[PDB]
């Protein structure tokens, strides 16, 4: 079953199979003293893998690559970071040094640079406006509008009907929107509505932190964020 913070010591990574050729990766990291789990995604594309998000730091990301080689045995050739925070880009230097081509939107790259985070090598164009969608290997990348951050992207895997929301989507047990220092609380519910409208057929929704669920994670996120904003 789906691993939680208690089952993953900081520095270890678990993989969880979501569908044929689709896995989440789960890592843990200390932030402001406390340990949190974090998810990303792995998608098979023929005999190579596309990585979505780092495992939140260099050591975790090196462990991620090791766990991928052990469990899956296919090379990660490209990676996309879904926003500029450390749980998404921390580890990019490890990926790049391992031969993985790293990508993010221009906005994410600029914000990462400004924050002193690692910076993905390549820009993902065509994602500047809310509702924009582009194909990238076996996934579609979608910019729903500002939410957890202004740059946040979501990822859909058409072959599996799996929607990876990153931090624009919250898990069902969540009662608050979490770290909102960079968030746009006024726009976030609208951004979620765009996701709902564009991916009504999604069967699994994976949040950036915590348990995957169904489409209800989307409405739940809008609700929490509205209640948070008050």
Rg, C-alpha atoms of the chain: 16
- Contact predicate 126/99, CB 8 Å: no
Q: Output 50 or 170, the one with its CB closest to Zn ion.
A: 170
Q: Establish whether 25 is a catalytic residue.
A: no
Part of the chain binding Zn ion (CB under 5 A), chosen from 67-75, 112-120, 159-167, 220-228: 159-167
Cα dihedral sign, 81-85-87-93: positive
User: Which partner in Zn ion, Na ion, none is near 75 (CB below 5 to 8 A by kind)?
Assistant: Na ion
Q: Establish whether 148 is a catalytic residue.
A: yes
C-alpha neighbours within 13 Å on the C-beta side of residue 80? 30
Q: Output 85 or 109, the one with its CB closest to Zn ion.
A: 85
Q: Output 67 or 87, the one with its CB closest to Zn ion.
A: 87
Determine which residue in the list 14, 44, 85, 109 makes contact with Zn ion, applying CB under 5 A.
85
Q: Output 39 or 61, the one with its CB closest to Na ion.
A: 61
53 binds Zn ion (CB under 5 A): no
User: Which partner in Zn ion, Na ion, none is near 50 (CB below 5 to 8 A by kind)?
Assistant: none
Q: What are phi and psi of 190, to 5 degrees?
A: -65, -40
Strands 48-52 and 76-80 turn out to be parallel
Q: Establish whether 87 is a catalytic residue.
A: yes
Using CB under 5 A, count the residues that bind Zn ion.
3
- Contact predicate 140/151, CB 8 Å: no
Q: Does 25 show up as a binding residue in the annotation?
A: no
Q: Largest Cα–Cα distance of the chain, in whole Å? A: 48
96 membership: H or E segment, kind and range: helix 92-97
Spatial separation of the C-alpha atoms in residues 169 and 171, rounded to whole Å: 7
**Minimum distance, C-beta of residue 57 to Na ion, in the bound complex (Å):** 17
Can you tell me whether residue 173 is helix, strand or coil?
A: coil
User: Which partner in Zn ion, Na ion, none is near 76 (CB below 5 to 8 A by kind)?
Assistant: Na ion
87 binds Zn ion (CB under 5 A): yes
Spatial separation of the C-alpha atoms in residues 119 and 110, rounded to whole Å: 8
> Would you give the distance in Å from CA 208 to the centre of its chain?
5
86 binds Zn ion (CB under 5 A): no
**Minimum distance, C-beta of residue 15 to Na ion, in the bound complex (Å):** 13
User: Which residues fall in the annotated binding site?
Assistant: 83, 85, 87, 148, 167, 209
User: For binding to Zn ion (CB under 5 A), which residues are involved?
Assistant: 85, 87, 167
- Binding-site residue positions for Zn(2+): 83, 85, 87, 148, 167, 209
* Catalytic center residues: 83, 85, 87, 148, 179
């Amino acid at each position: 079953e789906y691993p939680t913070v208690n089952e993953i010591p900081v520095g270890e990574v678990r993989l969880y199979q979501i569908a044929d050729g689709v896995w989440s990766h789960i890592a843990t990291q200390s932030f402001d003293g406390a340990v949190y789990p974090s998810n990303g995604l792995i998608v098979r594309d023929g005999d190579e893998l596309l990585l979505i998000d780092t495992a939140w730091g260099a050591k975790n990301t090196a462990a991620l690559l090791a766990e991928i080689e052990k469990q899956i045995g296919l090379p990660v050739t490209r990676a996309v970071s879904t926003h500029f925070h450390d749980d998404r880009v921390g580890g990019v230097d490890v990926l790049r040094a391992a031969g993985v081509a790293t990508y993010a939107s221009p906005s994410t790259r600029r914000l990462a640079e400004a924050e002193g985070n690692e910076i993905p090598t390549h820009s993902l164009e065509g994602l500047s406006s809310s509702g924009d969608a582009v194909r990238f290997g076996p996934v579609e990348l979608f910019y729903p509008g500002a939410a957890h951050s202004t740059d946040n992207l979501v990822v859909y895997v058409p072959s599996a009907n799996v929607l990876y929301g990153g931090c624009a989507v919250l898990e069902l047990s969540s009662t608050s929107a979490g770290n909102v220092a960079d968030a746009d609380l006024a726009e976030w519910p609208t951004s979620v509505e765009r996701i709902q409208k564009h991916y009504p057929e999604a069967e699994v929704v994976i949040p950036g932190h915590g348990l995957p669920g169904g489409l209800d994670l989307l409405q739940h996120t809008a609700n929490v964020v509205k209640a948070h904003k008050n």
